[PDB]
Amino acid sequence: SKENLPWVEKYRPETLDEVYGQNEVITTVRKFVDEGKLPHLLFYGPPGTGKTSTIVALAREIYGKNYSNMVLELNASDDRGIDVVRNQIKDFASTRQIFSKGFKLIILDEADAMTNAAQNALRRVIERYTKNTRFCVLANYAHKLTPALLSRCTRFRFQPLPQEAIERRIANVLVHEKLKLSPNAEKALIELSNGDMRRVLNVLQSCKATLDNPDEDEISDDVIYECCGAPRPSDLKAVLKSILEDDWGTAHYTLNKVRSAKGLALIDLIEGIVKILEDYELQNEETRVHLLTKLADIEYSISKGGNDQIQGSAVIGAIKASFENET
Amino acid sequence: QLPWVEKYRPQVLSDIVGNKETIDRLQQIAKDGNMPHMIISGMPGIGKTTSVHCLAHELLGRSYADGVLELNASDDRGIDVVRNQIKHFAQKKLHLPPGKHKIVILDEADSMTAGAQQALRRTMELYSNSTRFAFACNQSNKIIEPLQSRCAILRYSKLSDEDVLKRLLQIIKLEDVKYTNDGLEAIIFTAEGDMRQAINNLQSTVAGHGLVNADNVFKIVDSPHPLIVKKMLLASNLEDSIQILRTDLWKKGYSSIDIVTTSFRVTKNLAQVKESVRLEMIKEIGLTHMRILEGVGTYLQLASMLAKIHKLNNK
Amino acid sequence: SKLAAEQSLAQQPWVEKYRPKNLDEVTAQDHAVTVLKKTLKSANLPHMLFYGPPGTGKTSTILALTKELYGPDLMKSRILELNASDERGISIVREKVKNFARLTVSKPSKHDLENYPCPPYKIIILDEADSMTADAQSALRRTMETYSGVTRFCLICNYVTRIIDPLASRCSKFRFKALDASNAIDRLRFISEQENVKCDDGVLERILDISAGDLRRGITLLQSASKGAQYLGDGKNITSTQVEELAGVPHDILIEIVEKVKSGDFDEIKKYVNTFMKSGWSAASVVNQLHEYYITNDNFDTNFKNQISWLLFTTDSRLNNGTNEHIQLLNLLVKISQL
Amino acid sequence: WVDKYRPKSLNALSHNEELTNFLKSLSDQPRDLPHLLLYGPNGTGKKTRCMALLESIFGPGVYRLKIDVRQFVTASNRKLELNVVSSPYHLEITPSDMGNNDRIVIQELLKEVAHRYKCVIINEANSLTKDAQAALRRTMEKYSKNIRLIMVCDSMSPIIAPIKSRCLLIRCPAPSDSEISTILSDVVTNERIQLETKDILKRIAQASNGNLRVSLLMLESMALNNELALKSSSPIIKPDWIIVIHKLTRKIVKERSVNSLIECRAVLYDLLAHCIPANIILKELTFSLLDVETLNTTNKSSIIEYSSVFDERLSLGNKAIFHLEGFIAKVMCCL
Amino acid sequence: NTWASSNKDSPISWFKIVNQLFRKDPHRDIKEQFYELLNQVELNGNSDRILQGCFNIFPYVKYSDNGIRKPANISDWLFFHDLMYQSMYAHNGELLRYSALVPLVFFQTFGDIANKDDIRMKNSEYEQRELKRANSDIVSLIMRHISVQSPLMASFTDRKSLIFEILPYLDSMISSDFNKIRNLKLKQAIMEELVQLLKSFQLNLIQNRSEGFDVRGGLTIDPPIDEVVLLNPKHINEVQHKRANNLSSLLAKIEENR
């Protein structure tokens, strides 16, 4: 049953109408398939944008419910070498379908992990067998693909999911599940996503599990912040306030108790304070220069280890000395 | 329709805008004959396979079909193939003009195994009067020294801005495309001496927008927004540069590596500011790039780089 | 049988001798063991991800949980423990872990079901998941997502950032808190009473203070102090000074450094540093103690405190690169003396 | 000579009586012995004390040792050649004899080797890369009934925290000048040296900074110049390189120019070409430049700051002269 | 005079680029000269050799000098280049683009109109690297010899302590003027201790008979400690004359003991 799959897998789009966010490429692909001229596709984009779902729904719309038999889907999990190409891909392209009549589809998912020799052998397979089969290459990094292979396919860049589409998908999930979501909670959820539907679905399932109730209540910002993890905005602003206004020893004690009560990390607090202070309308940019320089130096030092207490005191002193120029 | 890289693939050695010295060398060789064993090395997309194809075609005339043996990396090129098929082709009898020879083209020679490369030595040595070998590779170090000792070495270099610009102008004239100077400049900038990639990006921009303009090129082939990077670096106030970096580059999915590397290029090629301030900005950009290469690539590092650049510009 | 185990535990160092065998022996990590005890009566154990400072008891907690779940008989048949001392590439994750997950649970005996819950699933734990490459980690995604009915995955790490975001989302995050004096004084006093460790009033609380949230290091220091006090045979009590001497920390020598920094010129400071470097001390520990003293003491100006914090940060960052301890320590003391 | 007069047991030690008693306490029950890490100044006598402790844990045959060779194969066909000091009761490995291939030797050799156990002496544990230390982290705990580690180092700063926790830590403070003088007295009465006044021995200690290995070697070196008869004003024969560094500092404080920078670079090249590390060169140069009474506190502070900066540079670089010449030029610009 | 075809197809000898990096033309814009030099450094692909050339040349170049700080600023760049060059073996060569900037800092800092003459250059580093390798191999052989004989000495001897402390004293003991010692018994005792030290370090006295007709085959120590310890050319000549008489006396004593 589908009620056992996680929310990332349960809500996988099955038709091209369930793929939100991508409109300029989805409409163009639909037109390509309806009019017949479907060229070799290269779906390039970040993880969680919906490239695999898009190509799966496309193959479903093209071949019907028997997609799993008329399409050759290869990925990084399968052995993709030069001999694998030579045998499997060439035998698939040269032959015809065993279930119906029509062009074939080879979905090379995650083809950014293929060997250079494999791509050099495949670039002439794409150019030779081009009247009975097509090629779809999915990629997250366009630098791992040879320029020869990169030039034979039409490139489609999957942009990160915008606010409207991600809110539409959130509303669809809240309709499918007996769940309610607060508006500010929804905004905070969209903020910590960066256009990644996987993260949204995962944390939505997790906060539904956090509810502890039969779901007669709503999901507020507190639930998301306590469940999604990472220094809560409350503790973040409390530490920032104690650093900016309170005394040195009191600020040290506050930072220590905050980072030791929930086991928070100093790097997460650093990034959070950087994100919060970005909205601060400040005086002459010298304070911002000092703050950014010292915080980046402390982050680079943390990225290699050291004393957490010394680095926390360094963060406190850096923020304080940077703000002392604003007077 | 056929892509412009394949449709406008050069068929005569004069159409190649590559390295002039080696091109005239191969042209004189095809004119006089007596083609020796050769190994052409370089980088992808500079006219290596097309060069040897044009040389073989011009040298063999109509006998190209029965006098040229093409073996790519897509075909088996092991010890057994070199032992049987290459030797049978080299021993094959063929009546040719008194200035021509049978040509064995081996594309991607850097992928052949050590056994095949070792067996090819005497194969090319005993039949060096009726069979000639032309290797096309990207790394000459992958081919054993005994094989390199029996052949000429042609190292192809990157294509300068002028040659790629001339080839693109010829293609535009042959295709009647609407373009502009800044668009072609952005195309050549994103090509990085890669003629094949340049023609591919040009054709993609044409088929996607019709007009070859820098905005479209930085849109259909969007990667780091150079002009946007230049406007970010040339900002007068820190908040403006920070907002540009946040909205235009970071909120649109541009990776930090692309931002810093595009940043380095913009600076190196900058002319608005003096030399010393440019060197200091490159030094800051360089340190930021070093930090990112270690996996510390975030928005805070780029913000600190911009802050240090502004502090340098702050007299 | 059991007596041999008792004797081997009695002849074992105190770290392994007093390893928590049940979920009740966990002294401070109560939030996690409460859920682990509640799910012991149910059968819905989710995929878990333990993360926190070293020596907080993650491995001990998961071992005690697996014991209380399966009994000493099924302890060796329904557990797949993979540590960092084994190969954990893509090949291993795809073959061995997936074959163990796809396999069915072993049949419990008649004595197992009478005393232990015997859940219908097995447990695959991966200790020290920081060394696992991200591709081998992503390979575990569907392996743990589809076979969740028969196996449960328990990841253990120190840095939660080293694990990819999908794996951190699939597992329930359990953060183990640092074991300071407050939440570990009871366990330390129990260990001291069980071994007849005659100490003073403020020794144990001091030991954890040196441990900085690490019960393993505190137990090791307590064992060393007990050995050093039993060798002497004087019958006296262990002192905090004797503990901080063998812990790599003395207070009087640090106060001398503070006096030389406050009052003194370059020559006297250089001479005292040359004399202090004769006695082997780690420069990192000296910098940490100076930082604690300067930031904690409420007798210095805030403008002085910003500068001392930045100087200590720079000194630690320079020492973290393999530099000469003498030169760095002298430069730090000279720079903080000019303040 | 240092080697002719060296203690072979715990009862033969002649300084740090509390450390000798602690070692006897630790060797009273030898089977329930955890891993040990001897740390302290270089030249104190920790490598002699570890062997003396082994002589208490095992028979006197621990000193009858032999040198063998073992070959290793890395990820490529580069063959790693490592010599091993072995004994019928213990073995000694020094991972400081190669580059970044310490992890391979450590893991493979220790796994092959793993009273009732065989002791392992890791010499110069500071040169152990972080990856080799991480590999040894779990090997220390998995095999604790067959392999016990005795790691000798001069500073626990580069040693990771897990390794520090996995073994007992034993500090070896440098012997006092009085104990060094008493040892030199026994040495000169046994080697039949002629001392006009005993205080010279004290001065030797004052020239060694607690180092006994350096003290005895310098005493023997100056005994050959005075022809086995030390006078009241025998010149402390500071190692030739120390005299070269002192002359370099004199040249630095005397002339500050590029023409003098050329001869400074030449002196640095001549020093580096004769098997003298650049970190020790920088340390001695800075310490003897701070001793120049002509400079003031403002100059000495800048000198120590530049020396720390260029020490970090040298620890992050490989072309040592590229940092040494830069430090010298910065010092010239400061003065 | 053949150079036209070279201007036609050949680049700029890295030496010519180094001499151009120290030259400023007073008649051209400094920015145009900088971009021309950048393109020449990039086209050559050998930024390291150009920089090593700049490093050997800068002390001999005329540069308006205030306090020789210019050299202090350039030590920081050179250190930046060394870090970048080390990182090129660890990371994919994206950092190679910044390698051309370090040579151009020499043009900014030390470029002067006074530098009209071409300074010829050499490769002291390859000779120093081969010498450092040879000295390291000698030291590694001595350390192996100590490991085979001295069972305990090898545990206390680091490579650095051996080079800076032990070998200079050992050589000073062997080079000591035994002709000043009137007491024959004390001379014999010192010679017996020195024979024991030569045996502990496995130092062999070889009669080098490679002397063309000149009646004094010099005695040499194998391995030659002299090449590692004797940094000063003045001390080499003084020590060689003293050692020749000592080594003959030591050889006679080794033969007596044999």
Ligand SMILES: Nc1ncnc2c1ncn2[C@@H]1O[C@H](COP(=O)(O)OP(=O)(O)OP(O)(O)=S)[C@@H](O)[C@H]1O
């Ligand atoms: N545009 C979208 N609309 C709706 N759901 C989406 C969208 N994009 C992603 N999702 C959800 O995220 C899940 C994963 O999508 P995928 O297509 O596998 O991600 P991806 O774009 O292929 O990136 P990868 O696989 O990491 S390279 C889907 O099953 C959906 O539940």
Ligand SMILES: Nc1ncnc2c1ncn2[C@@H]1O[C@H](COP(=O)(O)OP(=O)(O)OP(O)(O)=S)[C@@H](O)[C@H]1O
């Ligand atoms: N000098 C050139 N003049 C004109 N077109 C060129 C030139 N070099 C490359 N091209 C174009 O690039 C296409 C492919 O060139 P190739 O010779 O295959 O590249 P390459 O230099 O061999 O590098 P490889 O094949 O990746 S190792 C040709 O079909 C042309 O369209």
Ligand SMILES: Nc1ncnc2c1ncn2[C@@H]1O[C@H](COP(=O)(O)OP(=O)(O)OP(O)(O)=S)[C@@H](O)[C@H]1O
């Ligand atoms: N909460 C605790 N209660 C009691 N003893 C504890 C606790 N935490 C740690 N210990 C002791 O410390 C020893 C080590 O426990 P571990 O679980 O291995 O620590 P850890 O969290 O795994 O640290 P690592 O492995 O470096 S991440 C145990 O055997 C106990 O003796």
Ligand SMILES: Nc1ncnc2c1ncn2[C@@H]1O[C@H](COP(=O)(O)OP(=O)(O)O)[C@@H](O)[C@H]1O
């Ligand atoms: N107990 C002792 N009594 C006298 N001399 C000693 C004693 N222990 C060591 N020494 C000597 O003092 C010097 C110490 O230097 P070294 O042996 O290199 O130190 P380490 O053992 O730490 O490597 C050597 O000459 C050594 O033989």
Ligand SMILES: [Mg+2]
């Ligand atoms: Mg996918």
Ligand SMILES: [Mg+2]
């Ligand atoms: Mg080609």
Ligand SMILES: [Mg+2]
């Ligand atoms: Mg653990």
